[PDB]
Amino acid sequence: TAPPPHVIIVPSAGMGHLIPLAEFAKRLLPRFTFTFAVPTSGPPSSSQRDFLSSLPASIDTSFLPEVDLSDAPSDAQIETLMSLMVVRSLPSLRDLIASYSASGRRVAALVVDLFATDAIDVALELGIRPFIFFPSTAMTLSFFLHLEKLDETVSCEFAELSDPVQIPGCIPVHGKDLIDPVQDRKNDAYKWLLHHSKRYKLAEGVIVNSFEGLEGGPIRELLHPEPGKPRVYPVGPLIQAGSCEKGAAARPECLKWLDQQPRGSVLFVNFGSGGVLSTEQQNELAGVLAHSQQRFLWVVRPPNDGIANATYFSVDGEIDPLKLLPEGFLEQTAGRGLVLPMWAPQIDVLSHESTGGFLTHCGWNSTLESVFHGVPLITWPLYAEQKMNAVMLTEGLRVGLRPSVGKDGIIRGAEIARVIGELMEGEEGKRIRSKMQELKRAASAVLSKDGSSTRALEEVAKIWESK
Ligand SMILES: O=c1ccn([C@@H]2O[C@H](COP(=O)(O)OP(=O)(O)O[C@H]3O[C@H](CO)[C@@H](O)[C@H](O)[C@H]3O)[C@@H](O)[C@H]2O)c(=O)[nH]1
């Protein structure tokens, strides 16, 4: 038996990046051992500790000594804070790598998050293969690689463009729909994003959680070799498994309800833990759901701008979101819909045969989970690159419908009802379902014993073991 080479992972964001990073590492076990070298600006969170400690033994964690970010403006976007966090943690990253190399272990590669590219300098100085793990779309990867050119050939704010931005190999996108950090070109967020995009060519490869059957255009453009463009390895869809392949067979309460409903008849509504809606926006959605004949399963959170404090609370002690719904919504909805507070077993809901639709904020892991299990989408993007994902999902793949937002930022009930009704019982909804089932089959194929994605993973492992 050969000694497993060691690989170090530097994440820069929260769970949306840890989950796919962990899945990537699990696919490569036990050939390698892994260390999550997590930069921090304070005591690690309980969810971080719990998620990383639940991983197989070959993946351990090191929470780097926290850096001081108090000098940054309180207006600083997360991109700026992540870049500062990684840059200031690099000496501790050297120390961690030293602890491994001084014991005789071979450090084969350094896998950096999309905002941790400054750690590539460490890898280069130590003779370690630097790779970038890209937990988003090939379309967003293409945009990153083209950001330099776009920055030089456009002076105004991108929203002010009248024509849609053309990214090599992707559907056009309006400047207003481009990622959050580029909406204020004067903010440090944009300068950091630009700085990181120019460093992708320093890596030996970019590992992207997508596949050609989902993003044909961008992936074929990216695989086409050009000098100054890194190798790209499509390995998606990397997603967690369901609780069926976990352990005890105890059934959550929402899945009991889903069994009682008929096939493909429930619209799952989940904006994610960072998708709090205003009171008005949540009232517009509730009103449509109350007057609808559609069965739904809706995860709700306390709005961000309640006129008054909370009066009701849950046993744990947090604000009770259900007592904030409109008067009589719960009685009006009983039987047809089930409202859940804060969280739900998303993957298992999407794998349920009764689930027929998914109203989502278009987080890429959620998109990938919906695609793998074949649940068509209502694309309700909110922040980060979700608007880009929505354009590609609705106007490119045509596996969802996007409700138009108003001039005040509100998606009125008319648009919510339009997309719900079309998806769940219109004629376009059947064509969208057929297409999504085709992508479901393509997603299982690339993960097959000999598929596009499994071979790309094998290529990465081979490169790491080489030389
Ligand atoms: O109530 C919930 C909410 C989430 N999840 C799971 O937690 C993950 C959430 O994934 P995702 O929707 O992608 O979370 P985000 O935090 O929104 O992802 C961030 O990171 C992604 C990768 O860059 C980007 O695509 C997103 O835009 C960005 O917001 C998934 O595995 C969910 O199945 C649950 O089980 N229950």
- Give CA angle at 123 (121, 129), nearest 5°: 130
Query: Which residue has its alpha carbon closest to ligand 1 atom 31?
Result: 365
Q: Where are the alpha helices (DSSP H) in 198-239?
A: 216-223
How far apart are the CA of 385 and the centre of ligand 1, in A?
A: 12
State how far the Cα of 397 lies from the Cα of 331, in Å rounded to an integer.
38
Q: Please give the C-alpha separations between residue 120 and each of 11, 90, 137, 148, in angstroms, as whole numbers.
A: 13, 10, 22, 19
Place of tokens 């370690």: 128
Q: Is 283 annotated as a binding residue?
A: no
Helix axes 364-373, 15-27, angle to 10 degrees: 50
State how far the Cα of 433 lies from the Cα of 417, in Å rounded to an integer.
18
Q: Is 346 annotated as a binding residue?
A: yes
Q: CA end-to-end span of the chain, whole Å? A: 18
Asked if 135 and 11 count as a contact pair (C-beta separation under 8 A), the reply is no
Q: Is 361 annotated as a binding residue?
A: yes
CB atoms within 10 A of CB 129: 20
Q: Locate 462 and state its tokens.
A: 């081979």
State how far the Cα of 21 lies from the Cα of 143, in Å rounded to an integer.
21
The atom of ligand 1 lying closest to the CA of 239 is: 31
How far apart are the CA of 187 and the centre of ligand 1, in A?
A: 26
* Residue 451 DSSP one-character state: S
How far apart are the CA of 227 and the centre of ligand 1, in A?
A: 34
State how far the Cα of 4 lies from the Cα of 360, in Å rounded to an integer.
40
Phi/psi zone of residue 43: left (φ > 0), alpha (ψ -120 to 50 degrees), beta?
beta
Residue 199, burial from CB neighbour count under 10 angstroms (0-12, 13-18, 19+) = middle
Q: Please give the C-alpha separations between residue 319 and each of 115, 276, 340, in angstroms, as whole numbers.
A: 34, 13, 13
Q: Is the peptide bond before 73 cis (omega within 30 degrees of 0)?
A: no
Place of tokens 């744990």: 316
- Name 6's bridge partners: 33, 107
**H or E element that contains 250:** none
State how far the Cα of 371 lies from the Cα of 351, in Å rounded to an integer.
10
How far apart are the CA of 348 and the centre of ligand 1, in A?
A: 14
Structure determination method: X-ray
Ligand 1 pocket by Cβ (under 6 Å): 15-17, 19, 135-136, 240, 270, 272-274, 299, 343-347, 363-366, 369, 384-386
Listed residue (82, 207, 86) closest to 136, CA to CA: 207
Strands 6-10 and 400-401, by their bridges, are unpaired
Query: Which residue has its alpha carbon closest to ligand 1 atom 33?
Result: 346
Please tell me whether residue 205 adopts helix, strand or coil conformation: strand
State how far the Cα of 286 lies from the Cα of 86, in Å rounded to an integer.
42
Q: Is 270 annotated as a binding residue?
A: yes
Which of 6, 17, 146, 352 is catalytic? The answer is: 17
* Residue 135 DSSP one-character state: -
Q: Strand ranges (DSSP E) for 279-354?
A: 295-300, 337-341
- Name 9's bridge partners: 36, 111
Residue 311, burial from CB neighbour count under 10 angstroms (0-12, 13-18, 19+) = exposed
The yes-or-no answer on residue 113 being catalytic is: yes
List strands edge to edge, sheet with 355-360. 337-341, 295-300, 266-270, 355-360, 377-379, 400-401
For the four alpha carbons of 381, 379, 197 and 206, in that order, the dihedral sign comes to: positive
- Give CA angle at 131 (135, 215), nearest 5°: 40
How far apart are the CA of 364 and the centre of ligand 1, in A?
A: 7
**H or E element that contains 166:** none
Backbone angles phi, psi at 365, to 5 degrees: -65, -40
Query: Which residue has its alpha carbon closest to ligand 1 atom 1?
Result: 343
- Name 59's bridge partners: 34
Residues 6+ apart with CB under 8 A from 202: 117, 120, 124, 130
Q: Is 386 annotated as a binding residue?
A: yes
How far apart are the CA of 14 and the centre of ligand 1, in A?
A: 9
Residue 352, burial from CB neighbour count under 10 angstroms (0-12, 13-18, 19+) = buried
Please tell me whether residue 171 adopts helix, strand or coil conformation: coil
State how far the Cα of 454 lies from the Cα of 452, in Å rounded to an integer.
6
State how far the Cα of 337 lies from the Cα of 325, in Å rounded to an integer.
13
Listed residue (186, 178, 193, 183) closest to 81, CA to CA: 193
Please tell me whether residue 311 adopts helix, strand or coil conformation: coil
State how far the Cα of 445 lies from the Cα of 214, in Å rounded to an integer.
12
Q: Locate 299 and state its tokens.
A: 């995860």
Backbone angles phi, psi at 323, to 5 degrees: -75, 0
Longest distance between any two alpha carbons in the chain, whole Å: 68
Listed residue (1, 185, 162, 178) closest to 77, CA to CA: 185
**H or E element that contains 354:** none
The yes-or-no answer on residue 195 being catalytic is: no
Query: Which residue has its alpha carbon closest to ligand 1 atom 25?
Result: 364
Tell which one of 246, 255, 299, 364 to mutate to probe ligand 1, the residue whose CB is within 8 A of the most ligand atoms. 364
Q: Is the peptide bond before 237 cis (omega within 30 degrees of 0)?
A: yes
Q: Is 257 annotated as a binding residue?
A: no
Please tell me whether residue 61 adopts helix, strand or coil conformation: strand
**The one-letter amino acid at 150:** L
Asked if 205 and 120 count as a contact pair (C-beta separation under 8 A), the reply is no
